[PDB]
Amino acid sequence: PNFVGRDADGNVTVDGRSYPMAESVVATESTIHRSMKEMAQTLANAYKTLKHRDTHNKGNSALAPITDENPLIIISVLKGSYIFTADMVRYLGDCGLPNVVDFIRINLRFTELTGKHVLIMEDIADTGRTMKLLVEKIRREYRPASLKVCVLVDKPGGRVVDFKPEFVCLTAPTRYVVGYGFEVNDRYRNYRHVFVLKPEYAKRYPSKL
Amino acid sequence: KPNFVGRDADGNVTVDGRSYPMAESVVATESTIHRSMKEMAQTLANAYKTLKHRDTHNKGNSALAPITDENPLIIISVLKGSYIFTADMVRYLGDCGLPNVVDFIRITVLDNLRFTELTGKHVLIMEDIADTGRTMKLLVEKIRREYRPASLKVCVLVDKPGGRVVDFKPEFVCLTAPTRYVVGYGFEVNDRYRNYRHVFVLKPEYAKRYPSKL
Ligand SMILES: Nc1nc2c(ncn2CCN(/C=C/P(=O)(O)O)CCOCP(=O)(O)O)c(=O)[nH]1
Ligand SMILES: Nc1nc2c(ncn2CCN(/C=C/P(=O)(O)O)CCOCP(=O)(O)O)c(=O)[nH]1
Ligand SMILES: [Mg+2]
Ligand SMILES: [Mg+2]
Ligand SMILES: [Mg+2]
Ligand SMILES: [Mg+2]
């Protein structure tokens, strides 16, 4: 468990390291990983028994269980979800749920999604527009057996369209957060904890990368 | 967390009691992997923390700038096999206090970089493995020609030097592997086993186990 405090200048510290950009801590690494570990069991319990189209043996007409032959299809949204997805699939492996990951940037190279169980792994749902558009696009272009969304952070106070993620690790207020995949022009993406950003830092790096 | 390698009643390799029927042997357990990544982050921090490169945060500045959050180390992560490696390493680099930003490239070039200001920057390629050396040889040449960065270096999780058909030497290597096909921790066969925490040598009987297109 990480120790959260304040340094001599009032900056947020976690495990003795100062974070001058942070207004406060939303969730430390150990809290995030506990939430994701429980979510991995939640995802395993929801999918381990399901069956979907057999593409390993196309000669088999029946529905096949979720195995290494026909794993769960996971769509990971770059770039904000790559660190979240990296830890989740390993926790899913701990829970014995076979899965494969392809990436989308808002494109995939997976093509046999029809009749499959597909799970989207996204960093955050705020207004809901990003995932509302993605689910509609995947459903119309692939028609999976099922399509669900797992987000690391949900902001239900920001929802302005009709979208609700089925699986949520953390619930946050309508504040701009950084760390553990979240960033300000890619800065702070590699931090192990999620912080509320100081508004003074929101426009700190305006130059294009 | 020290891992225990053994065999089950059927003769399959086990790591911490979990059976891996696809594995012929263990190249490196999770603790071995993360120990080398922790030491590599220190090596990378020491090699870059005092260097300077072009200031693109303040375009009105003419002097070279240190590596800061304003002008961080540019990391190019090669999809897909390097994404788990990259996710762990950049967090270890944060532990070492090395500011960095990550963009992704996919090559067979399928997905291009979105970063555009690499000229005169220190750029670090993060790749999962170097086998024949071709993929990285071509990628080093393309980035050098297209951008001319201040420095361009390659950090691989696994080096297989016994497989070289071209002359390529990555500057930083976490682990060395025998000239075998490995799976686990980013490495896969048709995307299977990518999420395993240990690197195994795959059994030859599993080489073409999943031929169907995903
Ligand atoms: N770092 C951070 N980003 C947030 C946050 N909320 C939304 N977003 C936007 C997340 N994403 C922006 C990343 P980009 O590739 O465009 O730079 C867009 C996804 O937004 C979620 P939604 O469509 O509003 O539900 C937040 O709290 N912290
Ligand atoms: N799973 C596995 N793949 C190997 C191996 N060696 C090369 N490769 C090819 C890896 N790469 C593609 C697989 P990924 O999904 O990571 O993008 C190709 C890069 O090959 C390295 P090189 O050009 O031969 O030096 C190996 O031992 N195990
Ligand atoms: Mg992002
Ligand atoms: Mg952003
Ligand atoms: Mg590769
Ligand atoms: Mg930093």
Author numbering:
A (entry chain D): 9 to 114, 132 to 234
B (entry chain A): 8 to 115, 129 to 234
Study text:
One potential new drug target is 6-oxopurine phosphoribosyltransferase (PRTase), an enzyme central to the purine salvage pathway and whose activity is critical for the production of the nucleotides (GMP and IMP) required for DNA/RNA synthesis within this protozoan parasite. These enzymes catalyze the transfer of the ribose 5'-phosphate moiety from 5-phospho-α-D-ribosyl-1-pyrophosphate (PRib-PP) to their respective purine bases (hypoxanthine, guanine or xanthine). In both enzymes, the active site is situated at the interface of two domains referred to as the hood and core and is primarily comprised of three pockets identified as the purine base binding pocket, the 5′-phosphate binding pocket and the pyrophosphate (PPi) binding pocket.
Although the phosphonate groups are swapped in the two structures the hydrogen bonding networks in the 5´-phosphate pocket are virtually identical in the two complexes. Within the purine binding pocket, there are more hydrogen bonds in the HGXPRT complex compared to the HGPRT-I complex. In the PPi pocket, the phosphonate groups are oriented at slightly different angles in the two structures, this is due to the fact that the linkers/attachments are different and the presence of Mg2+ in the HGPRT-I complex. Nonetheless, both binding modes result in the L53-K54/L86-K87 peptide bond adopting a cis conformation. In this location, there are fewer interactions between the compound 2 and HGXPRT compared to HGPRT-I and this difference is the likely reason for this compound having a higher Ki value for HGXPRT compared to HGPRT-I (6.54 μM vs 0.11 μM). Since the crystal structure of human HGPRT in complex with compound 2 is known this complex can be compared with HGXPRT. The main difference between the mode of binding of this compound in the two enzymes is that in HGXPRT the phosphonate group that belongs to the linker fills the PPi pocket and the phosphonate group that belongs to the attachment is in the 5´-phosphate pocket, whereas in human HGPRT, the positions of the phosphonate groups of compound 2 are inverted.
